[PDB]
Symmetry: D4
Subunit: 220 residues, 8 copies
């Protein structure tokens, strides 16, 4: 099972770097010009380079929702799916842990914790997180799919830009927590789980809907 564990470490390392570079760029070094575009591209380019790296071996899910979507899409065994989520959660905490150690406390903040924007209820926040992950999973499933007569497009860049779009929209509502592991890492390290179920229920449903809309309403 050498090819199995190498993918688990790939999911561990890539999620570590995804959270490290993702949360790190999200750290408010400045209350100055709008960080939304910078952070959105950071998460996107982070996912783009990691899919380009470990995408051929683990799929570069780096997201319990994404792993949940392939589990729903019947493209991964239950066991491997639990293995990825643990590796993603364990890696996300590690990435935010190293980030906590290298970042000065004045700019660590709440470690880029996904908090609900004022005026955004948990019901509205859940729907936003559903649609954020729905399009994201839809893009992943349509991009990772090998069934098409055409042959064009970069996989890592298309999926990363879908994540960038999710942050260009969702950062104002929920901080764009389209990744339960990315949401779990600052919560576990700051002892703040306020409305944290939104960042699990939302993306998981959005992953399931994106896994279902594609498999039976877009490409049977």
């Amino acid at each position: 099972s050498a090819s199995f564990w190498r993918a688990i470490f790939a999911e561990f390392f890539a999620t570590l770097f995804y959270v490290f570079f993702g949360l790190g760029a999200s750290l408010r070094w400045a209350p100055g010009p709008l960080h939304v575009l910078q952070v959105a591209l950071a998460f996107g380019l982070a996912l783009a380079t990691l899919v380009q790296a470990v995408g051929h071996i683990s799929g570069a899910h780096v997201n319990p929702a994404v792993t949940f979507a392939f589990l729903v899409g019947s493209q991964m065994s239950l066991l491997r799916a639990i293995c990825y989520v643990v590796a993603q959660l364990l890696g996300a905490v590690a990435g935010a842990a190293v980030l906590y150690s290298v970042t000065p406390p004045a700019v660590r903040g709440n470690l880029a914790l996904n908090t609900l924007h004022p005026g955004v209820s948990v019901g509205q926040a859940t729907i936003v997180e559903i649609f954020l992950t729905l399009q994201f999973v839809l893009c992943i499933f349509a991009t990772y799919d090998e069934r098409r007569n055409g042959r064009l497009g970069s996989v890592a860049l298309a999926v990363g830009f879908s994540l960038t779009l999710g942050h260009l929209f969702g950062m104002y509502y929920t901080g764009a927590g389209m990744n339960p592991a990315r949401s779990f890492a600052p919560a576990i390290l700051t002892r703040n789980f306020t409305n944290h179920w939104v960042y699990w229920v939302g993306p998981v449903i959005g992953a399931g809907l994106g896994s279902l809309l594609y498999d039976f309403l877009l490409f049977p």
Copy 2:
């Protein structure tokens, strides 16, 4: 006709998400730093991920002008063209409806309504909207074309960047309403159709000119 209706739902869903993520990022959460670059990339990355998703099944037109261009380009029957526009219009309203329900009223604004900039007449606004959609259709037609000895380039990223360019230029004039469905959704939900014909006449002509310049003056 299973392959027919699946494309209609694809045009419905993708236009829904195109307007949801497009108008949502356009919502002025802040009168702060310039949102033009953020919104332009949002619309572009929104169209990029949707072409990457439903582009193989419906073409990912998500634009009555774009559907009008292929109708002019004789690459789609009249019936299917009317089906797409209804699906696009119905989907755009739905996307802006969900956006209205998840966005707090303080940041909904006019729901990112395409309004004419002061000092920009309806004649100047129409021309801007023509050239915005002309290059956009030109890019789509040159990108969706299968007739070339070369084999390179990502389809979804080229078309999305053409839409981004249109917003990098047209947002100052007309809000860059290169999509009558994207323009119809906030107008129907805010009861504001001021100069709304500009966002239909403009893109439709620009679509026809782009469909004609390509088919008979660029690639006969």
Copy 3:
């Protein structure tokens, strides 16, 4: 000679739109947040969509320097090279003319005229314009080249990003006038040719050096 004139109109139209969307985004609608990144991507995405459109028929030079480089690179007859430059110059003026007609006079400014930054001498400005066009031509020649065992990369996106890089650097010095036609259009329409030779000598030399460094010091 049907295939000949269709490329001339392609060079005319694309340069028209290159200047229209390029200069238009460069128009200072606001002295607010830094426009450099917005304008740099605008010119780049403008060139990217135009190469994606008319690149298969005229090469999408839209630049007398670029046409000069292929003339130096012996990949185009003298006659066709003069035809392109006239079409580029004539198209650039037309693009800036339409832009002048659709843009309100309060935001037309000097029509995005390439002016030398204070403290930047004409000798320093020439060198900057040389290096701006040198890398730009180097990217074009390496990208348009068909001689390589590998097969990857998007042509239109690589060349457009090279132009974006040139504006990310050169806009502070000379406004990044890496295109004599783009520099000629506002000069002819504003009656301001101050230091205008810099935007011809600079890019032409940079085009020749880029055409020479590639053909005899990079890929013989």
Copy 4:
């Protein structure tokens, strides 16, 4: 050995332009809106166009760490590795020298010198520089690798975006000196080597770890 020296000049020229356009965009023409996103894309698009140019002949390492990684990865002889580093260091100094000559002294500053952010110790700065170069080398090694059944993606754009990500994160800590040559050029020309070993130890270790994690823990 004609194919050998042509790669050395390629590493010399490309590093010259990498530092010229990289440091030049990093020059604080304005203490205004956040330059991080602009500079990050500048370095990335600079590396993207140079890989697109001289990548087929020298690999477009333009980085002693990257050359060190391939030396560790056993994909380059020791001799050629020393040749590249000298060409990179010599080219970086030349690029910053020309930049010094064309940039007015008021905006040269410290020539974009990689300085440690306050509150960031040399130990934290080293780790940040390790992870910056680790993912960067990981992306390069996974992208330059010819061993995969799939066939998609643009090489120059994936590696440049990895460098952009490194600056989107590392510019706040160390200025994102993921290139000892890019760090050596302003240090040698400003007589300021404060904490300069961090920008050599950091990237070199990060290059070795990225060269090792890929070759024996990701793709044996």
Copy 5:
């Protein structure tokens, strides 16, 4: 009645300049950095210089609410109060008329029309306008009062800063229309009276409450 009419022209001219310089600075020449602080000081310094000019002859009310407050405070006859309001309304329209003639149409906008912010109901907007004018009248009444043993403070600067405070707070809600004449001028010249009663009911009540809280609960 020479001393009477000279005060009427003073109220006419000063309100003309108050609206001219007030609305003019409020004109969105740029969607860039936050204009709230600039506009708030503009209205304040406008009122400060006008009180310094015509304050000794008409009181420099330049506000139907302020004139209403002194009418409530029994410090002005009914007739003179109607004379001021007509002079203020007539002057405000004239000031916005000259501003319309000297400002290019691209930056006139809606002529700085006091519009209700999204999510701010007419009931909330009325209360904000009450408190804006309440403190403003309180400051005016306490400053114009001659009954105190102390002798210090600049009258024109204290009242202008109270108006500045009202815009520092109220511009986000209602545009800080603490002056029915300032609100009437763009409404009458743009044919837009949407929620215009809020900018009359609000300030008038706030003027009456400020005239009552001072005369019988602060200084009997």
Copy 6:
């Protein structure tokens, strides 16, 4: 005791408006350009107009620390001091209550709650709050003092600018909570008293030190 209770209502109303206009301007309507200067002037101009209004009757303390300082300075009986603090606390809650009712929930946030900046310990935060209130009380005591041969200066403007200075410095550390009532109002209405003792211990000590440094080390 008519002159007694009228001062209590003055302390109630002015603190209500101080918190209403103070917290309201502090409400993050935009994560855009730096709000520090806007908020600092808002609190200052708020205190300036209120001292200009109710300063002759209650002293316009609107701050339990300021009332504590005069209690320490032996210029106010214990009873009246407790009366003011209750009126200030009761008024502050009322001001933030009305602000909560008129402000949309999307821009209410945490109601401008004084939170400690990351990296600022409670010991450092206390000292900052001491020095913020120390200079503030020093300015108040030196300004309210009637013992000097000179006769110049505006009282309300000098004290308000001292509060502005405190926010120009202290907003980055503790949000500049130089007023326990201003700090108590959002805490009691948001159920968040995290580190709230810092905003009481800090200002009270700073008030006592400022009351002591002036009375026995500056003006005996």
Copy 7:
């Protein structure tokens, strides 16, 4: 005539410093956040400190228009008026000359030359400059007037804030050239007198109207 020449040197020195600190702050060190508020306060605080310095001896006119207004107001002999204008013009050139020598050429620009904004005709620019100087002279005449029963207000701060208001409004139109000497200094040192008569005709008329409106329609 010792008291005469000391006022001439006062007008020479103060205008020198008015232009030095005024134009210097207007020098675009950064195309970043809006400089209008910074420059407006700079000119205002510059005039405020100079009136506080040399106002008791020369009146601190530092403006040919202001000197023209007192010449119209019959408060100064013709001879002394010509003496001031020469001293102001000579001093303004000297102030901009020293500024030229101490400011690096990269940030000197056009030496803060009053240029007409695009879309602002010379007729509209003249009217703006009239109203800018009209209120400014009105404030000066009402502030320098000794005929009033009241006794309050700071002279230097009221006049400086009137100049600040003029720049808060006029900088977008004409750069707020309310001072022909301030407009003459960069024009004579840059050899650029384009539309320079606007900055003489405008302020002089505005000075005459302000000198007439005050003397015969405001305070006979």
Copy 8:
């Protein structure tokens, strides 16, 4: 000599707070929007509140140059002048020491050290520092002077605004180090005395020239 030492402690404490609040606001918490206006008002309002506090007892010099000017102006004995400078220097170090202890190391930076801007030579920097302190001393001497028939103006606000003007202009050149004590405090605590003589020679000469221009060329 009780009245003597109380002024020394006043100069010690006020300079401590002047540097504490002055340098603290100058600390770059954010590389965002332009801090020049914020810092300029901070130093000004800091000096304004301190003159309002300890101005009646020590003069609130808080500046070795200002103390040097009164020593030149023959308004203070040599001994008292040395006493003030030691108290100012000792107090400045203490203020920056407390600031160092309360500010997190990530935002301490170089403790707001007055460094020369690139392209500004030590000769140009000296002249700028001369004119910065010259007008500042001129304002102080004209404001502290008791010889005038008029009676108006606030002393503390006029002098603080003169310091604000000096920072509105001088911060771009030298950081506006118009106070050798303010310049000495971060230099002694950061071990960085690069070009530190400029911040002593400059202000001292500017103080002497301002002390001489006033006493013998403005008010004999």
